[PDB]
Amino acid sequence: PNRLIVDEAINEDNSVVSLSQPKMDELQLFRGDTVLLKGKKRREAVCIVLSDDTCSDEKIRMNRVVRNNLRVRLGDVISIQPCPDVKYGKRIHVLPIDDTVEGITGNLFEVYLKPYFLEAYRPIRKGDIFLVRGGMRAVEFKVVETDPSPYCIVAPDTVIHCEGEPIKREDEEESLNEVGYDDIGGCRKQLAQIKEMVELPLRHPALFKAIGVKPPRGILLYGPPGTGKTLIARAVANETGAFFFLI
Amino acid sequence: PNRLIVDEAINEDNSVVSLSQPKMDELQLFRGDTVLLKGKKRREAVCIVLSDDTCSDEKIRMNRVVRNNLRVRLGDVISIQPCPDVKYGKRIHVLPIDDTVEGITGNLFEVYLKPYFLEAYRPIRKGDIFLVRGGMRAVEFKVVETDPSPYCIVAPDTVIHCEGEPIKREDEEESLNEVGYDDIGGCRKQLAQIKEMVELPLRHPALFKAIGVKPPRGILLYGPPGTGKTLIARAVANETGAFFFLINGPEIMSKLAGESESNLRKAFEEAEKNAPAIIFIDELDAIAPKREKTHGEVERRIVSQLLTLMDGLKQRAHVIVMAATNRPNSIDPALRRFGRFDREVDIGIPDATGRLEILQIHTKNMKLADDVDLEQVANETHGHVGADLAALCSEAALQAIRKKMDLIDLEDETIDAEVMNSLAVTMDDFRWALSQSNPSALRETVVEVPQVTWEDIGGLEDVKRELQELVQYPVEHTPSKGVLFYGPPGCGKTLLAKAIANECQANFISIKGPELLTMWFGESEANVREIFDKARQAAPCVLFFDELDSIAKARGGNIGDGGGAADRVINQILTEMDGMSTKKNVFIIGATNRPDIIDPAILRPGRLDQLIYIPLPDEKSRVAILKANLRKSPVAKDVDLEFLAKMTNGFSGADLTEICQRACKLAIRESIESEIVPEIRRDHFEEAMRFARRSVSDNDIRKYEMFAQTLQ
Amino acid sequence: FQPSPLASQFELPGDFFNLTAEEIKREQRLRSEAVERLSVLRTKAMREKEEQRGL
Numbered sequence A: 001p002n003r004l005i006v007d008e009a010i011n012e013d014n015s016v017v018s019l020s021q022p023k024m025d026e027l028q029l030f031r032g033d034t035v036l037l038k039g040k041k042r043r044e045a046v047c048i049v050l051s052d053d054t055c056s057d058e059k060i061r062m063n064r065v066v067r068n069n070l071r072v073r074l075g076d077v078i079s080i081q082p083c084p085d086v087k088y089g090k091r092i093h094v095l096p097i098d099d100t101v102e103g104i105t106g107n108l109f110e111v112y113l114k115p116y117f118l119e120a121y122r123p124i125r126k127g128d129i130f131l132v133r134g135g136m137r138a139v140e141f142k143v144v145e146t147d148p149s150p151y152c153i154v155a156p157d158t159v160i161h162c163e164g165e166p167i168k169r170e171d172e173e174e175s176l177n178e179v180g181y182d183d184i185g186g187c188r189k190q191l192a193q194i195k196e197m198v199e200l201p202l203r204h205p206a207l208f209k210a211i212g213v214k215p216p217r218g219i220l221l222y223g224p225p226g227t228g229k230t231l232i233a234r235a236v237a238n239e240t241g242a243f244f245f246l247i
Numbered sequence B: 001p002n003r004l005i006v007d008e009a010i011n012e013d014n015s016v017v018s019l020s021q022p023k024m025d026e027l028q029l030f031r032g033d034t035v036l037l038k039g040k041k042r043r044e045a046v047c048i049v050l051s052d053d054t055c056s057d058e059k060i061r062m063n064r065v066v067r068n069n070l071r072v073r074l075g076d077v078i079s080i081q082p083c084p085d086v087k088y089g090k091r092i093h094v095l096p097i098d099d100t101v102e103g104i105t106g107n108l109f110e111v112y113l114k115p116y117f118l119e120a121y122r123p124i125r126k127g128d129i130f131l132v133r134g135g136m137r138a139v140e141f142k143v144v145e146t147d148p149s150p151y152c153i154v155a156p157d158t159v160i161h162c163e164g165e166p167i168k169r170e171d172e173e174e175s176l177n178e179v180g181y182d183d184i185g186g187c188r189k190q191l192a193q194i195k196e197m198v199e200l201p202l203r204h205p206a207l208f209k210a211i212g213v214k215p216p217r218g219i220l221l222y223g224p225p226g227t228g229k230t231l232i233a234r235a236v237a238n239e240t241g242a243f244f245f246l247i248n249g250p251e252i253m254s255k256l257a258g259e260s261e262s263n264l265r266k267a268f269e270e271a272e273k274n275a276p277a278i279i280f281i282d283e284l285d286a287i288a289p290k291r292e293k294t295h296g297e298v299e300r301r302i303v304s305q306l307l308t309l310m311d312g313l314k315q316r317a318h319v320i321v322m323a324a325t326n327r328p329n330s331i332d333p334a335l336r337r338f339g340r341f342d343r344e345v346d347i348g349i350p351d352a353t354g355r356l357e358i359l360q361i362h363t364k365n366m367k368l369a370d371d372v373d374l375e376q377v378a379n380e381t382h383g384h385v386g387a388d389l390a391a392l393c394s395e396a397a398l399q400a401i402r403k404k405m406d407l408i409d410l411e412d413e414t415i416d417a418e419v420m421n422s423l424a425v426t427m428d429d430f431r432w433a434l435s436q437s438n439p440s441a442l443r444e445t446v447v448e449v450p451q452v453t454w455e456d457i458g459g460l461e462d463v464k465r466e467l468q469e470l471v472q473y474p475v476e477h478t479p480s481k482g483v484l485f486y487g488p489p490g491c492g493k494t495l496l497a498k499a500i501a502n503e504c505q506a507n508f509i510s511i512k513g514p515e516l517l518t519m520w521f522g523e524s525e526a527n528v529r530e531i532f533d534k535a536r537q538a539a540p541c542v543l544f545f546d547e548l549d550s551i552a553k554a555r556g557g558n559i560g561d562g563g564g565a566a567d568r569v570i571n572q573i574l575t576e577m578d579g580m581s582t583k584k585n586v587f588i589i590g591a592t593n594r595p596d597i598i599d600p601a602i603l604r605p606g607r608l609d610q611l612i613y614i615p616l617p618d619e620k621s622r623v624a625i626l627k628a629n630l631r632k633s634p635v636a637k638d639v640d641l642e643f644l645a646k647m648t649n650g651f652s653g654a655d656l657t658e659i660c661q662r663a664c665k666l667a668i669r670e671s672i673e674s675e676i677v678p679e680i681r682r683d684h685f686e687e688a689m690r691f692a693r694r695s696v697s698d699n700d701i702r703k704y705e706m707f708a709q710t711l712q
Numbered sequence C: 001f002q003p004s005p006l007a008s009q010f011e012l013p014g015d016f017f018n019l020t021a022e023e024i025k026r027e028q029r030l031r032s033e034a035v036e037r038l039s040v041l042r043t044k045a046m047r048e049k050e051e052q053r054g055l
Ligand SMILES: Nc1ncnc2c1ncn2[C@@H]1O[C@H](COP(=O)(O)OP(=O)(O)O)[C@@H](O)[C@H]1O
Pocket: A183, A184, A185, A186, A187, A225, A226, A227, A228, A229, A230, A231
């Protein structure tokens, strides 16, 4: 009950999750409402739900940033619940991650965090990692301290701090600048074919052991140089989490 | 007396065997009676006896499950002892075999044992091992307790129990999932050829140890990958009991000098120690490539070591060596010298019937929906081999699995048997898999029995009888082994060759102008020998060389370059024909539209001695042609086919077909336009008559008639 | 009728499973003839003449 398969999203926004309307009406989770997503290791993420005409009833569409925070991967199943009583915050303390702020200086708040939270009403939770783009760099930020807990809505009238040493990255989270499916442009049909052939043998290895069917043994990608052959191979391994060895 | 030789089953069911009715009459038992079978090592099994029209009078047909319980093999002898005293059981305890229950859980009785025995009334004996298929898994069980003893009949009121750990298999018992003869679909003739050559020295070694004459030492299986070359080699070893040693080129070639040759000769020594044995060397062209293609010492020395190891087989009694290649001419020719690998079998590509049989084998464990039509699939999968049909079944299963598992969401080490039991593969899942599958054998020529029969050819009643007599006479009573057809185009020359092959159930090999030209253009006329060798391997077959003068015309025809009537390819054809006997069951048919410019050697005694003229159809034949072309479509009663035939006085059969297709197209267009009529009306034929024209002029007919009278 | 359990109790001779020269040559001859029959090029009339023998 209220357990849906994690899928890819078209909307790249980090505060947006898309669900098919029949489930939004059945669960009383309507466009604009704030919803919680339950991931692994008793972790959760907060976001705003929108409708579309592309999501399946049994799936939830989200981007890489949300899946990383939930410690989930495409094809798994997560629990969804509304939280209409979420309130606005008052004080938000955000720090950059040192892995992404290197060789650059200046006021990161005015360039990155300020337009990110400028009348956006984004839902944040303590410990969330989110990516803000600009200046030809992609800088990751973490929410490290808030007055409300464990989550709130960031209103334009709140006070956002960006002072102190950058925060270290934890070993349990992956970099948001790593190659994923959102880095592949054309040949989306080819990627879909590969995903169907590769993601399930690796995501649910017990399923192929349990069912008497032979998995694919190898995929040859051919075409001119510079088309994304090596890009797909990396994106698939990074999205599924399988150990990657380069030859 | 009361003893029969064990043979293969036709009915795959595990509780029944088939006898020839005269033996059931001698034993005074009826179809459905329960009998005991006495095998080796004082073992017995209980089964039901039926009969059919194919079992030999002196043989008993039983499947692998029955043979394994008796610990007997094909070619052995058992006794039949009716046991009418068998009664119904009260309680039977059945437990699975561990080797097949791994990764699967749930209530095995409800999924497998219950529907298997329910209202089946199968005989059961304590210790029996049997297989129940389902849920994409093959799970076999053993009987550990029976309230009656030592055997009984299961009834709907019999208690079936199943509690306890899976049973470990005995070392003398083989798994029912191991490849055997029942896992091979098409190429049944090739399998029979291997049986004749291989089973005797392995089942009856005493016949060859008493004599100084050795059986064939090596068999080379060739054809496209994925056709069963290794499957046959393994199935034969598993059915006869000979030890199977697997060798392949890459495994030996990946080794360094010394280690490579050592491993190759070591395997041969092991085969003698474990004789009788079969040594299968895959990728023979990789382990023994032609020496002129490499300068490495390792490649040449390995060939030398294999050549001596093959010669040593006269000492290694009861060891047979088989090898697989893509083509017989892609390997070092030394291996094909007298002895060694002087025997070869062409596996080929399965036809529509063989492809269906292969699909039926792969789907044995699959739950199919009522909409699944494997025959239609086999008809569409042209150019596919068994390896591709296996992938097709796997992909269709995987698509069905994804559709349900996304909703089941069972994440554990094992899968419930119940959720697999409800999983079915539909036609939409096969259709999807067909779109994703791509044949691996699409470039090679596909040879099969044609679908054109005599009812598809209008007119030429005397030519039909002539061809039937030419093939039937040497069988019912030097007979000719070929015929040349000449006359106008579009009169049925090709259809005649197909129709005789159809009725004879013979393979039809079609050689067309472009193929004759390709050999000439590329100076590869030696490929003609391979065509004739294919005709022998495909026997019975009809070897049809169309457009015999296609090369002479390509070289000028009426003008001419550096050549004339003869060319590289026709001279190779003449050479090969002299090497084919009338007993090879190959009928060679030629056709030309210009018999005056074809090398006359083809008609000389011993070759295409029969010569038949095919004129334009007459009035009654033209009506027959129209009726044959329209036999597959609804036609209105107002269509006067005799009127059309009376007008189309100079038309060929091909021209009458164009008229039919024109009227058909018009009828379809009208129906489509009305929906956005259900049968072809006279108006559609009358419109077609306004555009259809004769393709054969009166001058061309005179050319053919004068030729016919010149030769008589 | 009433079956008697004693009818199912019989022990084979030890030489039962040892096939003779005639039984082994007959089987090998039938194997060669079966391969030859698959190779024969014949019309439907000849095929039916053989099949019809069992009717
Ligand atoms: N289909 C594609 N979509 C997006 N970016 C691509 C695609 N193909 C190539 N690129 C980009 O071009 C570069 C290709 O470099 P490389 O990693 O060597 O890949 P390739 O295997 O194409 O040579 C990368 O920067 C990659 O992001």
